[PDB]
Each structure stands twice: as structure tokens, then as C-alpha cells.
Amino acid sequence: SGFRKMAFPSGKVEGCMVQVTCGTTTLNGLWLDDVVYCPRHVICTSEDMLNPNYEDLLIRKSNHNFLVQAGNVQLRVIGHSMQNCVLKLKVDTANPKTPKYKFVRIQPGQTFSVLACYNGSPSGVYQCAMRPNFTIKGSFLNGSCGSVGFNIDYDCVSFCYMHHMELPTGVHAGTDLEGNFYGPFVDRQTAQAAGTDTTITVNVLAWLYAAVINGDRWFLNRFTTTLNDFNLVAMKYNYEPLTQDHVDILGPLSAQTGIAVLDMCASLKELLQNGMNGRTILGSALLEDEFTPFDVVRQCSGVTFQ
Amino acid sequence: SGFRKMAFPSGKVEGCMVQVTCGTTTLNGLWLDDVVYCPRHVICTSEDMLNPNYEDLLIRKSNHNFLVQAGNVQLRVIGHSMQNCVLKLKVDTANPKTPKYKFVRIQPGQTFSVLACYNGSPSGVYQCAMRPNFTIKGSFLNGSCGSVGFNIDYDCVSFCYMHHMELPTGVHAGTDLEGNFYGPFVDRQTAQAAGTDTTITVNVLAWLYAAVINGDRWFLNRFTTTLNDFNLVAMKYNYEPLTQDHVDILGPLSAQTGIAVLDMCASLKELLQNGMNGRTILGSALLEDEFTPFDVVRQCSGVTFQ
Ligand SMILES: *[C@](O)(C(=O)NC1CC1)[C@H](CCCC)NC(=O)[C@@H]1[C@@H]2[C@H](CN1C(=O)[C@@H](NC(=O)NC1(CS(=O)(=O)C(C)(C)C)CCCCC1)C(C)(C)C)C2(C)C
Ligand SMILES: *[C@](O)(C(=O)NC1CC1)[C@H](CCCC)NC(=O)[C@@H]1[C@@H]2[C@H](CN1C(=O)[C@@H](NC(=O)NC1(CS(=O)(=O)C(C)(C)C)CCCCC1)C(C)(C)C)C2(C)C
Ligand code: NA
Numbered sequence A, B: 001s002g003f004r005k006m007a008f009p010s011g012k013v014e015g016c017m018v019q020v021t022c023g024t025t026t027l028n029g030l031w032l033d034d035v036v037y038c039p040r041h042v043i044c045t046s047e048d049m050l051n052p053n054y055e056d057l058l059i060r061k062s063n064h065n066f067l068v069q070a071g072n073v074q075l076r077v078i079g080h081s082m083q084n085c086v087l088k089l090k091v092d093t094a095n096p097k098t099p100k101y102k103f104v105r106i107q108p109g110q111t112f113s114v115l116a117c118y119n120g121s122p123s124g125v126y127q128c129a130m131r132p133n134f135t136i137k138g139s140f141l142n143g144s145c146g147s148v149g150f151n152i153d154y155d156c157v158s159f160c161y162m163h164h165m166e167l168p169t170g171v172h173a174g175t176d177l178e179g180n181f182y183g184p185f186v187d188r189q190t191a192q193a194a195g196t197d198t199t200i201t202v203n204v205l206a207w208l209y210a211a212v213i214n215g216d217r218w219f220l221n222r223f224t225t226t227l228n229d230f231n232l233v234a235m236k237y238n239y240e241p242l243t244q245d246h247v248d249i250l251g252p253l254s255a256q257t258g259i260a261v262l263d264m265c266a267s268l269k270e271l272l273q274n275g276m277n278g279r280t281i282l283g284s285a286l287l288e289d290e291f292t293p294f295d296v297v298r299q300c301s302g303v304t305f306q
Helices: A054-058 A201-213 A227-236 A244-249 A251-257 A261-274 A293-301 B054-058 B201-213 B227-236 B244-249 B251-257 B261-274 B293-301
Strands: A017-022 A025-032 A035-039 A067-070 A073-075 A077-083 A086-091 A101-103 A111-118 A121-129 A148-153 A156-166 A172-175 B017-022 B025-032 B035-039 B067-070 B073-075 B077-083 B086-091 B101-103 B111-118 B121-129 B148-153 B156-166 B172-175
Touching: A017 A035, A017 A121, A025 A067, A035 A156, A054 A077, A111 A156, A201 A244, A201 A251, A201 A261, A201 A293, A227 A261, A244 A251, A244 A261, A251 A293, B017 B035, B017 B121, B025 B067, B035 B156, B054 B077, B111 B156, B201 B244, B201 B251, B201 B261, B201 B293, B227 B261, B244 B251, B244 B261, B251 B293
Parallel strands: A101 A156, B101 B156
Antiparallel strands: A017 A025, A017 A067, A025 A035, A035 A086, A067 A073, A077 A086, A111 A121, A111 A148, A148 A156, A156 A172, B017 B025, B017 B067, B025 B035, B035 B086, B067 B073, B077 B086, B111 B121, B111 B148, B148 B156, B156 B172
């Protein structure tokens, strides 16, 4: 037993990280088959960032201006193109370590693993949620740009995130691997509206189910509620509305524990209204919302990967 | 910026995990050079566990009773020996993926990465501390036994933990890779004393330094204290005594922030006495104690690995 914020094993993704340099900027690229993907702002000077014209900056660059290094070994760049906010560098060698992969655009409230990298070398691995306002709460220093987020579906790596930039709140924005920003963000260093950071209600419930499965049961009560009554209380606390689809998604957890979703919602309502009275759930004093129902099922049933 | 509980990249360790079966028990082994290490209780029936005589159980077993599988491929066992609470299975093939490695016995308060595995297949990766009472707060289901804990020192993997058993509190006990239990534990299914779980004071301070570096500063105050006065307050809250060695170890963090350790101790004293008044530090409502000063420096300076 026990329940931890757990990342996917990073081996298949470690074999894909390279270093990409353009001028004085060094960051990370993703090497899959004969393409290296990296943030297009690798081409920018610190002045360019304020108001970049990426088409105009990119025109000044040739293949030989993109230095791509795989560990100690230099890769030959035979092509470059911009797709949305990523550069695709065509190299003359297919990555021999390319795993089975796809590019997926994740939904808000879904989780993924980040392999934080610096100079093309993996630093560490952690779990993130795509927040309802399309930010993530990561750990990214200077040099971490081009670090990727992924899920593993048995042997297949689904890449969903590339790291580009930091908001003033210290949260993180980036693109899918087609170079489309999550959320309203643009790769320019100017004031930009981030949404209210709402709590992923369905994830909080999943985690309460995890707690009960792991024998933390103090917050169970004699009460029930309705979707409509729960949602009236939740909206006041900036919780996402709970839907019948969410009830259905929690089915395995309600089935395993014998605790109806609406009864668990009654527990959550009391915890929101009363707080935790200095008590903890799975060693947390806050309601955790970065575990999906799938994450909980997965970790409470224990299925593995390639 | 941002600060997360981050594991080491798991690739070098994923290449070492195998499945080990003896009778009806399947668990995980660690394959390094031509040796597979696994918990000796792989040999036990469910009845044996109550009061096992491992020498007597092991005598009934031959090399051909230990089924060792590396992905789909069977390994030939040419020898077996017991060292303390681990079995060493000699196989006829050196693991071609053996990284540079050592076996280290970690100190209480030190952290490491766990690669949770089932049937020899890596499931996920998370960070643990060796608690002052020589337990860890992991995520381990049936099948997870033989899962290992490690640190990476550039290219060298230091293995420090093998998972064996769960305490009634839901925390975890296991051995170093020489098969010596951390703490007072023995591999028998009988009532066993676990120590009080004290907080790793030096780690809490490291994390407060991380918070200040990441701009969470609300808990800084106008006050200072002394080691002796801090320790009087801490002992009441089951915090480890703070020593001058701990002050010296925080040196890089005090140097980077310009905040004397004793001034940070003054902040911690107020947080212990007053609580957090519903506020959070690095998105936590509790004082985090599973980050070492090295972990904080590492993640706030960003150095990488092989
Ligand atoms: C990344 O490219 C990298 O690792 N570079 C290598 C060379 C070291 C780098 C990572 C920064 C620290 C994690 N990313 C960037 O430099 C991007 C690009 C330039 C500026 N930033 C960036 O992250 C900005 N943040 C930023 O501009 N954010 C906003 C504007 S803002 O923060 O509200 C403010 C107006 C500056 C106050 C714009 C984007 C949407 C969110 C807000 C900082 C360097 C200031 C952290 C690009 C092109 C955005
Ligand atoms: C592990 O071997 C494994 O993954 N096995 C494969 C086949 C599935 C397995 C993991 C268990 C769940 C994580 N480990 C064990 O089975 C060990 C071995 C037998 C029993 N346990 C074990 O973890 C016990 N816990 C246990 O006995 N703990 C105590 C005693 S106790 O919990 O206080 C009590 C008396 C039972 C109430 C003894 C060890 C020190 C801590 C306390 C449980 C199966 C009950 C979880 C071994 C030999 C210890
Ligand atoms: Na917390």
C-alpha cells in the first residue's frame, strides 16, 4: 500500500533528449526518427524576446547555425522548418533509440511525466497536471526549455508537452509537439492574462478514493449530496463543476470501495466548508487534485510498462 | 523556477530489473554483472512467513527452482547464496546494460529515488527519504518486493535500498544491497516495534530556503534564535535536534539567500508554534522534510547526469 505522486519510468524518453544551440542560446530538443523538435525561440536574442518576428529571425538562419549534440556526438542538420511554435530540425541520422511514439494534445485535468533536462542531459522526473487554465506547476530553470511531458501506454510514449516559458506566478506554459501552445499564451516576453487556477474536482475525488483504499477514512461521514447541491458549494471554492461523465469515470473506484461518488462528494463538501482541522489525508494537509482516476486505479492496481 | 519532489532519471536502473519466481512467489530482482539480487523471502510459503527458518527453507532449493526472466528472455541460474536478507543468484550472462554502480548504506535523513516494479517491469519512479526511524513512505503493492532505491552521481548509480515489507502504519522497510535491514526490522510476519517518526529539521530548513529562492517569503520574520533555544522548541514537536554540522551543510543556501540559518530557525519556530494560518509554502500546507540541502542546491542550480 501507500500512495505517491509517481512519474513514468523515463528511460525511453532519456534516449531522445539532445542539446540544441543557436547563437548564445542552448536548450533541449526531442530527437525522434530523423527530426529534432525544439522551441522556435532558440533563434532569439534577449532583445528579440520582447517583440519577436519569428519569420524574420528564422530567415537569417541556415542548417549549419543549429548545433545539435546527442551526448558527445554532433548531429548533421539537413533541414529546418517552423511548425507553429516549434522548430523541426531534419538530421541525417534516425535516432536508433526512437521508441514507439505518438503526439497527443492532452485535455485539462490530465496528468503527465516531465523529464527536466539541461544541455540535453536528463536532470530528473516528476508528475504534472495540465491545470484548467492550461499552466503546469513544474520545476524549470534556465536551460530547461525543450524539456518534454509524456505518458507511456505499455510500450508507446505519448508526448504531450514541450516546455517554453514561465508566468509571473511561477507556473509554466508550453506547447504540444505540433507547437500549439496550451491555453491563450504566445511566445513573446509581454504581459499576458492567465485564467483563474480552478481545482480539478474529479481528481480530488479520485484521491479521496485512493485515501480510503489506503485506509485513511476519518473524513467519511453519514451524509450524501446531489450533483447540483455539490456544484453550488464547489463553485464558491473555485472547483470545476462535477458532471455525470466524472461520476462514470470514478466507477472503478466507487466499485472497489463500495462508496457512491455522491457520498464521497458529501465528504469533500464538509472538508471544503470545515477544512481539515489540522489532520492529513495521504500525508497531505491540502486536497490533492493532480491525480486522475486512471492514475489512482493504475497505482492502486499496479499495472506496468516496457 | 518552481520546486518539485523530483526523482533521478530511471533509465540506467530500468535496464537492471528482472522477474524472479520461486514456487508461487513472483517478485523483482536487480541484475548487475552476472548476479541477480532479490529478497530471501522469495523462497517462503505464506505459512513460512510467520516464523521462517531461512537456512532450512533455502536447503530445499536448487538453482533450477529460481526462475529469472529479463523481459521475455530466461536467464540460467548457475549459483545461489544468501547474504543477510538477500539472495544472490549467479547467472551465466553478465547484464549488458550494467551501469557503473556501487552499493551504499544511506544515512537517516538522506533521500533516494524508488523505481517501483511489478513482475520485473518498471511501473513508476518517485523520491523517498530514509526516515529517522529507518522506514520510508513509499507506494508498494503485492509484487513490488525487490524494487530498489538509488541515487545517480553523474554516471554512477548508488543503490541503497531494496523493498521487503510493509509496517501496520503503511510505511515501508527494506535492506541495503548487502541485505542488512535499515532499522531494527527482521523479515518475519510478527509484531515489531517501529520508532517514533521524527521530522528531519535540516531538510525542513533546506525546503524553507528553496521557498525563499522561489519567492515564497511570507514566513520570514524579524526574529532570530540560538541552536539551544530552537532545539528546546523543536523537541516538543518531535523534530531532530539541529547541530552545527547541519548549519554548515546549509551554507550554500544561507550564502545564496543571505539569510542566516538561525534567522530561518526563528521562522520555523513561529511556523511550528503558530501553524501556517491556512497559507501554503511551495504549494504545501505542511512543513516538507524529504528534501536534503543537496537536493535543494541541485534543483535550484540544475546540475544533470548520464
Ligand atoms: C527557455 O527558453 C530556456 O531554458 N532557455 C535557455 C537559455 C537558457 C526559457 C526558460 C526561462 C526560465 C525557466 N524560456 C524563456 O526564456 C521564455 C522565452 C522569452 C522569455 N521567457 C520566459 O519564460 C519569461 N517569461 C515570460 O516572458 N512570461 C510571460 C510574460 S510575464 O512573465 O508576465 C512578464 C511580462 C515578463 C512579467 C510571457 C509568456 C506567457 C507567460 C507570461 C521569463 C524569462 C521572464 C521567465 C519567451 C519567448 C517567452
Ligand atoms: C513482497 O515480498 C512482494 O511483493 N511479494 C510478492 C508476491 C507478491 C511483499 C510485499 C507486501 C505488500 C507490499 N512482502 C511481504 O510479503 C512481507 C514478507 C512477509 C510479510 N510481509 C509484509 O510486508 C507484511 N507485513 C509485515 O509482516 N510487517 C511486520 C508485521 S506487522 O505488520 O506489524 C503485523 C504483525 C502483520 C500486524 C513485520 C516486518 C516488519 C514490519 C511489521 C504484510 C503482508 C502484512 C504487509 C515478510 C517475510 C515480512
Ligand atoms: Na500539504
